[PDB]
Amino acid sequence: MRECISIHVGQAGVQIGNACWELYCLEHGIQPDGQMPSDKTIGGGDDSFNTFFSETGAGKHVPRAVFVDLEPTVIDEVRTGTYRQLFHPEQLITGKEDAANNYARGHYTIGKEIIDLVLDRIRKLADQCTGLQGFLVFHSFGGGTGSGFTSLLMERLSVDYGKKSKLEFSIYPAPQVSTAVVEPYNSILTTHTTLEHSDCAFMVDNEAIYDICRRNLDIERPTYTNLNRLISQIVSSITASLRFDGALNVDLTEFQTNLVPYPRIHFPLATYAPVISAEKAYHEQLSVAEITNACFEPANQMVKCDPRHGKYMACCLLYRGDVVPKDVNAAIATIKTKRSIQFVDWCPTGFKVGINYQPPTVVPGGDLAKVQRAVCMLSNTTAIAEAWARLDHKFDLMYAKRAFVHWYVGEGMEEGEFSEAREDMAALEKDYEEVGVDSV
Amino acid sequence: REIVHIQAGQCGNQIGAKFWEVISDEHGIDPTGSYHGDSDLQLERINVYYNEATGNKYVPRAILVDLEPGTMDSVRSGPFGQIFRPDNFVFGQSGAGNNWAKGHYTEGAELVDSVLDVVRKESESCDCLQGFQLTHSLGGGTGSGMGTLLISKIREEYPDRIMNTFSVMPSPKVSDTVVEPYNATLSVHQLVENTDETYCIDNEALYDICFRTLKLTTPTYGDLNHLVSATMSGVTTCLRFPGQLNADLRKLAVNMVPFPRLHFFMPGFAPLTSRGSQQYRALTVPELTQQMFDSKNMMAACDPRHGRYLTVAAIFRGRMSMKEVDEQMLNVQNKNSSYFVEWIPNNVKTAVCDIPPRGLKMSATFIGNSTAIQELFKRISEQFTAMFRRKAFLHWYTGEGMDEMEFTEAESNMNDLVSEYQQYQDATA
Ligand SMILES: CC[C@]1(O)C[C@@H]2CN(CCc3c([nH]c4ccccc34)[C@@](C(=O)OC)(c3cc4c(cc3OC)N(C)[C@H]3[C@@](O)(C(=O)OC)[C@H](OC(C)=O)[C@]5(CC)C=CCN6CC[C@]43[C@@H]65)C2)C1
Ligand SMILES: CC[C@@H](/C=C(/C)[C@@H]1C[C@@H](OC)C[C@H](O)C(C)(C)[C@@]2(O)O[C@@H](C[C@H](OC)[C@@H](O)C(=O)O1)C[C@@H](OC)[C@@H]2O)CO
Ligand SMILES: C/C(=C\c1csc(C)n1)[C@H]1C[C@H]2O[C@H]2CCC[C@@H](C)[C@H](O)[C@@H](C)C(=O)C(C)(C)[C@@H](O)CC(=O)O1
Ligand SMILES: Nc1nc2c(ncn2[C@@H]2O[C@H](COP(=O)(O)OP(=O)(O)OP(=O)(O)O)[C@@H](O)[C@H]2O)c(=O)[nH]1
Ligand SMILES: Nc1nc2c(ncn2[C@@H]2O[C@H](COP(=O)(O)OP(=O)(O)O)[C@@H](O)[C@H]2O)c(=O)[nH]1
Ligand SMILES: [Ca+2]
Ligand SMILES: [Mg+2]
Ligand SMILES: [Mg+2]
C-alpha cells in the first residue's frame, strides 16, 4: 500500500523521468525487461518498492508512471530505448503538435484535445492501487507543455481526486539552456495556476545545476544528460523513504509536516552532497562531517539564492549509505556553532534527521563517483524568494511593453490572466517576507 | 477485581507489549499462555489482568488498537505476541500522520465503534470490573487523538469505573516532529476532564536517565521502554499480588487525588545504576530510599525540590525487613518535611511485596503527586504558544475540520491547570 503515481510531462519532465526510472531500476535490481530476480513474491506483494512498481503475473515490475507530451520525438526515444520493455504502450501518450513554448496552447488549444485521454490512463493506474498516496508531477516551467498542460492536468486532478496530495518537481529556467525568450511568462502563469493545487513543490534551478556540474564534476559544457543524472540523485533521495524501509528511515510525509508551515509556503530548497568526480574522489574519503557541511554552502543549493540572508523554518537531512547516528550528531553540533543558521522564532524544532541505509548508486558511464555515503538536505528558507524576485523582474520588463503577449491573446487568453498571475506572485513574495518577521 | 487494558498507536502498543511481556514473566506465564510457575501467590490475583481460557490457558485482557497495520504485525511476530486474543486486534490502514485531528475526529471516527465492541465484550466477561488502563503517547496521532476519543466514549458507557492511563509526553530531545506540542496540548485537555489517574511518563526524563545516569550514548526506544515496563510493573504490584494491602484502583485514587483536576502522577524507579562495575553491588534499603526520592531519578522532567508533595505512594519489592523500610521512609519525611504539605497529615504511604522483579534482589517504585509537575505542563505550553502565536502548522488541523477556538481552549485549560498546582505550592496551614 501507499502507492505513488508518477506523471512526466513535456520534454524536461519526460527526459528527467527517464533518468529517474533507470536509477530506480539499478537501485532495486530491476532489469531492463522488468524482471527482478531478487523478488520472491510473484504476481504481487506489499514490499516497499511496490509503492512505485506494480507486478504482472509473468513477474514484470512495471513503473507506476505516465509519460505525456504534445509531440512525439522525445517519448519516441523511450519507446525505442534501453528500457522500452519496461513500460506498457498505454503509459506513453503523445500528440502530433506541441505547445510551441506557449502556455496558452498547452492549457487550452492543444491540451484540451488530449486531457481526457491522459486522465483516463491515470485512472487505470489508480485503480491498481490499494491505498493511493498521491502524485509526483515532473515538468518544466518554461515549456509550452511543461507550463500550460501541467496546469490543466493539476486542475483536473484536484477535481477527480480531491485533496489527494500532489508533489511537483519543476525545472526553473536559466538562460544557459533556455529554449524560449517567453519562459518568464509561462513560469509565472503556471506557478499562479498551480499554487493552490500543489501540496509541495521542489524547484530545480537549471543554472544552479549547470554551475554545479561545471565546478564540481569538471564538465566544461554540461548537457541535459549531465543535468538530469544529477537531478535524478536528488529525486531518488527524496523518494528513497518510500521505496526502502529501515529502522532509522523516516517517511517523506513526516518531512512534509515539518516543511510546510502554511499552504502557500510549500517550496523547499534542496541540496545534495557529495557531488564529485571519480578523479577527485579517488584520493578523498568524504566524512559525514564534510558532506553535512557542504549542505550549507550557498554554491551547493539547487536554486540560486543566499540562505545566509534569510531565515530557516525547517532543515530536513536525508542521509543514506554508511552513516550512524553518532556521526550525524557531531556533524550538526559543529554546523550549529561554526555557522550562522537563523531559525524563525515560531519554529521550536528546526532540524529533522533520518538515515536510509541503502547506499547511493550511480549509472555506469555517468559523471558521479560512487561514494559510500550521501546526504540530501531539504530546507524551508525565506531566501528562496530571491528566485521569485528574479523571475518577476524579467516578467515585468517584457510585460510593461506587452512584448510577445499577442501570441497568448491570439490563442484565447486575456491580459487579465497575466496581471492576475503577476499579482499572485506579488503576494507570494510578500508572504515570504512576513513569515520571516520576528513575533510581537 | 478485573481490569481491561487498551493500547493505542505505535508508542502505546510498544510499551503495552513490553508490559505484558514483563508481568507475564512475573506470573509464570509462558508465551503460549500456559502457567509454568512455582509459587501460587503468581495465580492468587492472575484474574485481575488475565482471562482464564479453556485448558488452563491465561490470555491477557488486552485490546490492541492502531490506525495502521505496521505495529500490529510487529507485536504479533514478537516475544509473547501469540499470547494475545486474535479478536482483540483492531487496526486500520490509513494511519494518522502524527495528526491529532485525524486520530480524534476523522480517520479514528470509523474504527472507534469496532474497538468499543471488543471493549464491551471483555467488560461483560468480568466478575466485577474495576476499570480501564490505557497506554499511549501524547505526541503522535493515534494514541493521542484516538486514545482520548476512546477514553471519552468508554467513560460515557461506564461512567463510574476508574479510568487510568500511562501517558508518554513528547520531548524535542527524543523526537523530530514539529507538531508534537500541538498533539500533546489537545490531549492534556482531554485527560484533565476524563481520567481519574494519569501516570506522566516523560520522554525528556527517560532520555536524561539513559544518557546522563545510565551513560547510554546511543539510546533506543528499547532502552526507554524497558524503564517504562519496570515502572509499570512496580506501580501495579499491589493489584497483581496479595499482601498487607486490600487495595484496588478506586482506593488508590481516593487517597492520591485530593482535588479532581490534580490527578497527574510523577513516577520513579530504583534501582538505576550505569553499567557495570556498580551493577554487582548489593543494594541496601537506605540506598533504595535515597535513590527513590532523588530528583534526578524522577520520570517526569521536573524538579520536585521546586515544589511540594501532596501525596506519595511508595512500593518496595523483595526480601527485606519492614522495620528498615519504615525507619528509612520516616527519616526522609522527618528530615525533609518542608517538601510535604502539612495540611495533609501522614501523606506518604508504603507497601512491601515479597516477590521481586526479574533480575533484581530488591527494588522500589515511586508514585508522587507533586506541585512541581507544573514544570512539565509549562514546558509543553511554551512550545505550543511559540507556534500558535503565528498559527504555524495550523493548516494540517483545520484541513481536518478543526477550528482555532478548540486550540485556544486547550491551551487555556492547561494554563489553568498550571495555576492550580501553583496555588497549593504556596498554600499553608
Ligand atoms: C530513544 C529513541 C531515539 O533513538 C533517541 C534519539 C533520536 N531518535 C533516533 C536515533 C538517532 C539519534 N541521533 C540520530 C541521528 C540520525 C539518525 C537517527 C538518530 C540519537 C542518537 O544520537 O543516539 C542514537 C539522538 C538524537 C538527538 C539527540 C541525542 C541523541 O542521542 C544522544 N539530541 C538530544 C537531539 C538534538 O536535537 C539536540 O538537542 O542536541 C543534543 C540533536 O542535536 C545535536 C546537535 O546533537 C539531534 C542529533 C541528530 C539533532 C537534530 C534532531 N534532534 C532530534 C533529537 C536529537 C537530534 C537518539 C530516537
Ligand atoms: C525528599 C524531598 C525532595 C528533595 C530533597 C530535600 C532530597 C532529600 C534526599 O533525597 C534522597 C537527599 C538525601 O538526604 C541525601 C542528601 C543523603 C542525598 O541522597 O542527596 C542526593 C542529592 C539529591 O539531588 C537531587 C538531593 O538534592 C535531593 O533530592 O534531596 C545525593 C546525595 O547528595 C549529597 C545524598 O546521598 C525530593 O523528593
Ligand atoms: C539499575 C538496575 C539494576 C541494579 C542496580 S544495582 C544492581 C545490583 N542492579 C536495572 C534497572 C532496571 O529497572 C530497569 C531499567 C534499566 C534499563 C537498562 C536495561 C539499560 O537500558 C541498560 C543500559 C542497563 O543499564 C543494564 C543492561 C546494564 C542493566 O542491567 C542495569 C540496569 O539499569 O538495570
Ligand atoms: N534540466 C532539464 N531541463 C530541460 C530539459 N529539457 C528541457 N529543459 C528545459 O525546459 C525548458 C523548455 O521546456 P521543455 O520541457 O523543453 O518544453 P515542453 O514542455 O516540451 O513544451 P513545448 O515543446 O513548447 O510543447 C527550458 O528551460 C529547458 O532548458 C531536460 O532534459 N532537463
Ligand atoms: N517512550 C517511547 N516513546 C515513543 C515510542 N514510540 C514513539 N514514541 C513517542 O511517541 C510520539 C509519537 O507518537 P506515536 O506513538 O509514534 O504515534 P501514533 O502511532 O500516531 O500514536 C513521539 O513523542 C515519540 O517519541 C516508544 O517506543 N517509546
Ligand atoms: Ca513481489
Ligand atoms: Mg516539447
Ligand atoms: Mg510514528
Short mmCIF file of N, CA, C and O in Angstrom, two decimals, chain A residues 231-282:
data_model
loop_
_atom_site.label_atom_id
_atom_site.label_comp_id
_atom_site.label_asym_id
_atom_site.label_seq_id
_atom_site.Cartn_x
_atom_site.Cartn_y
_atom_site.Cartn_z
N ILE A 231 20.05 15.58 -11.22
CA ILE A 231 18.69 15.75 -10.70
C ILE A 231 18.14 14.44 -10.17
O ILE A 231 17.54 14.39 -9.09
N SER A 232 18.34 13.35 -10.92
CA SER A 232 17.75 12.08 -10.51
C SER A 232 18.26 11.64 -9.13
O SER A 232 17.50 11.04 -8.36
N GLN A 233 19.52 11.93 -8.80
CA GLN A 233 20.03 11.62 -7.47
C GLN A 233 19.25 12.36 -6.39
O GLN A 233 18.95 11.79 -5.33
N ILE A 234 18.91 13.62 -6.64
CA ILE A 234 18.07 14.35 -5.69
C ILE A 234 16.69 13.70 -5.60
O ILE A 234 16.16 13.49 -4.51
N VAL A 235 16.10 13.37 -6.75
CA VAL A 235 14.79 12.73 -6.73
C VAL A 235 14.85 11.39 -6.01
O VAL A 235 13.99 11.07 -5.19
N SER A 236 15.88 10.59 -6.29
CA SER A 236 15.99 9.29 -5.63
C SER A 236 16.09 9.45 -4.12
O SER A 236 15.48 8.69 -3.36
N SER A 237 16.85 10.45 -3.65
CA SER A 237 16.99 10.66 -2.22
C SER A 237 15.65 10.96 -1.57
O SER A 237 15.35 10.47 -0.47
N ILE A 238 14.82 11.78 -2.22
CA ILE A 238 13.54 12.16 -1.62
C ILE A 238 12.59 10.97 -1.58
O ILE A 238 11.91 10.74 -0.57
N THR A 239 12.53 10.19 -2.65
CA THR A 239 11.62 9.05 -2.69
C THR A 239 12.18 7.81 -2.00
O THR A 239 11.42 6.88 -1.74
N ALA A 240 13.48 7.78 -1.69
CA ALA A 240 14.06 6.60 -1.06
C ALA A 240 13.33 6.24 0.23
O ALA A 240 13.25 5.06 0.59
N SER A 241 12.75 7.23 0.89
CA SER A 241 11.98 6.99 2.13
C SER A 241 10.81 6.06 1.84
O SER A 241 10.46 5.27 2.73
N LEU A 242 10.23 6.15 0.65
CA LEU A 242 9.06 5.37 0.28
C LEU A 242 9.41 4.03 -0.35
O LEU A 242 8.63 3.07 -0.21
N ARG A 243 10.53 3.93 -1.04
CA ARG A 243 10.87 2.71 -1.76
C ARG A 243 11.62 1.69 -0.91
O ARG A 243 11.55 0.49 -1.21
N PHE A 244 12.31 2.13 0.13
CA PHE A 244 13.01 1.26 1.06
C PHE A 244 12.43 1.41 2.46
O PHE A 244 11.67 2.33 2.75
N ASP A 245 12.81 0.49 3.35
CA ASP A 245 12.44 0.59 4.75
C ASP A 245 13.66 0.32 5.61
O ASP A 245 14.45 -0.59 5.33
N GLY A 246 13.81 1.13 6.65
CA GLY A 246 14.90 0.95 7.60
C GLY A 246 14.46 1.43 8.96
O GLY A 246 13.51 2.21 9.09
N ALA A 247 15.16 0.94 9.98
CA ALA A 247 14.83 1.31 11.35
C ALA A 247 14.96 2.81 11.57
O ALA A 247 14.18 3.41 12.32
N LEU A 248 15.95 3.44 10.93
CA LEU A 248 16.17 4.88 11.03
C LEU A 248 15.60 5.64 9.85
O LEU A 248 15.70 6.88 9.83
N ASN A 249 15.04 4.95 8.87
CA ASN A 249 14.41 5.62 7.74
C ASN A 249 13.15 6.35 8.19
O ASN A 249 12.35 5.79 8.94
N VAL A 250 12.99 7.59 7.75
CA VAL A 250 11.83 8.40 8.12
C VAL A 250 11.08 8.78 6.86
O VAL A 250 11.68 9.15 5.85
N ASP A 251 9.75 8.70 6.92
CA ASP A 251 8.90 8.81 5.75
C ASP A 251 8.79 10.26 5.28
O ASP A 251 8.90 11.21 6.06
N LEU A 252 8.56 10.42 3.97
CA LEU A 252 8.55 11.75 3.36
C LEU A 252 7.39 12.60 3.86
O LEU A 252 7.48 13.84 3.86
N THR A 253 6.32 11.95 4.32
CA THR A 253 5.12 12.66 4.84
C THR A 253 5.46 13.30 6.18
O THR A 253 4.90 14.36 6.48
N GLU A 254 6.31 12.65 6.97
CA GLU A 254 6.76 13.25 8.22
C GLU A 254 7.64 14.47 7.96
O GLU A 254 7.60 15.45 8.72
N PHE A 255 8.43 14.43 6.88
CA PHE A 255 9.17 15.62 6.46
C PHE A 255 8.23 16.72 6.01
O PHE A 255 8.46 17.91 6.29
N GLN A 256 7.16 16.36 5.29
CA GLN A 256 6.24 17.36 4.77
C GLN A 256 5.58 18.15 5.89
O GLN A 256 5.36 19.36 5.76
N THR A 257 5.23 17.47 6.99
CA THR A 257 4.66 18.17 8.13
C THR A 257 5.58 19.29 8.58
O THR A 257 5.14 20.44 8.77
N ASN A 258 6.86 18.99 8.75
CA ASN A 258 7.84 19.99 9.15
C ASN A 258 8.08 21.03 8.06
O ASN A 258 8.33 22.20 8.37
N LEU A 259 8.00 20.64 6.78
CA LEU A 259 8.44 21.53 5.70
C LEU A 259 7.40 22.56 5.27
O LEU A 259 7.77 23.58 4.68
N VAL A 260 6.11 22.33 5.53
CA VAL A 260 5.09 23.24 5.01
C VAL A 260 4.35 23.89 6.17
O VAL A 260 3.36 23.33 6.66
N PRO A 261 4.80 25.06 6.64
CA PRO A 261 4.13 25.70 7.78
C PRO A 261 2.84 26.40 7.41
O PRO A 261 1.98 26.59 8.29
N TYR A 262 2.67 26.81 6.16
CA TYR A 262 1.45 27.41 5.66
C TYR A 262 1.24 26.94 4.23
O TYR A 262 2.21 26.72 3.50
N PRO A 263 -0.02 26.77 3.80
CA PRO A 263 -0.26 26.18 2.47
C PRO A 263 0.59 26.78 1.36
O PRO A 263 1.22 26.03 0.61
N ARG A 264 0.64 28.11 1.24
CA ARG A 264 1.34 28.72 0.11
C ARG A 264 2.85 28.60 0.21
O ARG A 264 3.54 28.72 -0.81
N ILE A 265 3.39 28.35 1.40
CA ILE A 265 4.84 28.30 1.61
C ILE A 265 5.34 26.88 1.47
O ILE A 265 5.85 26.29 2.43
N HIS A 266 5.23 26.30 0.28
CA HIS A 266 5.47 24.87 0.12
C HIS A 266 6.58 24.58 -0.89
O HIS A 266 6.51 23.62 -1.65
N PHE A 267 7.66 25.38 -0.86
CA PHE A 267 8.75 25.32 -1.83
C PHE A 267 10.08 25.07 -1.13
O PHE A 267 10.87 26.01 -0.93
N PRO A 268 10.40 23.83 -0.79
CA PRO A 268 11.67 23.57 -0.10
C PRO A 268 12.86 23.77 -1.02
O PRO A 268 12.79 23.54 -2.23
N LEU A 269 13.98 24.21 -0.43
CA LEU A 269 15.26 24.33 -1.12
C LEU A 269 16.08 23.06 -0.89
O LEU A 269 16.32 22.68 0.26
N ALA A 270 16.51 22.43 -1.98
CA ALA A 270 17.25 21.17 -1.91
C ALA A 270 18.74 21.40 -2.08
O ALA A 270 19.17 22.30 -2.81
N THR A 271 19.54 20.59 -1.38
CA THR A 271 20.96 20.46 -1.64
C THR A 271 21.33 18.99 -1.64
O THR A 271 20.59 18.15 -1.12
N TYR A 272 22.49 18.69 -2.20
CA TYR A 272 22.94 17.32 -2.27
C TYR A 272 24.46 17.29 -2.18
O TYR A 272 25.13 18.13 -2.78
N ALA A 273 24.99 16.35 -1.41
CA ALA A 273 26.43 16.16 -1.33
C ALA A 273 26.71 14.69 -1.05
O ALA A 273 25.90 14.01 -0.41
N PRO A 274 27.86 14.18 -1.51
CA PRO A 274 28.91 14.87 -2.26
C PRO A 274 28.67 14.84 -3.77
O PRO A 274 28.18 13.84 -4.30
N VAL A 275 29.00 15.91 -4.49
CA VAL A 275 28.98 15.93 -5.95
C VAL A 275 30.44 16.01 -6.39
O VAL A 275 31.05 17.08 -6.36
N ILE A 276 31.00 14.87 -6.80
CA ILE A 276 32.43 14.79 -7.04
C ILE A 276 32.68 13.74 -8.11
O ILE A 276 31.95 12.75 -8.22
N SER A 277 33.72 13.96 -8.90
CA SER A 277 34.07 13.05 -9.98
C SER A 277 34.91 11.89 -9.47
O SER A 277 35.48 11.94 -8.37
N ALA A 278 35.02 10.85 -10.29
CA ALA A 278 35.88 9.72 -9.96
C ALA A 278 37.31 10.17 -9.72
O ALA A 278 37.97 9.70 -8.78
N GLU A 279 37.82 11.08 -10.55
CA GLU A 279 39.21 11.51 -10.43
C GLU A 279 39.48 12.11 -9.05
O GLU A 279 40.44 11.73 -8.37
N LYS A 280 38.63 13.04 -8.61
CA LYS A 280 38.87 13.72 -7.34
C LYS A 280 38.55 12.83 -6.15
O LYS A 280 39.21 12.93 -5.11
N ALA A 281 37.55 11.96 -6.27
CA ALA A 281 37.19 11.10 -5.16
C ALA A 281 38.15 9.93 -4.99
O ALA A 281 38.02 9.18 -4.01
N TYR A 282 39.07 9.74 -5.92
CA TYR A 282 39.97 8.56 -5.85
C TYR A 282 40.80 8.67 -4.58
O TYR A 282 41.05 7.65 -3.93
#
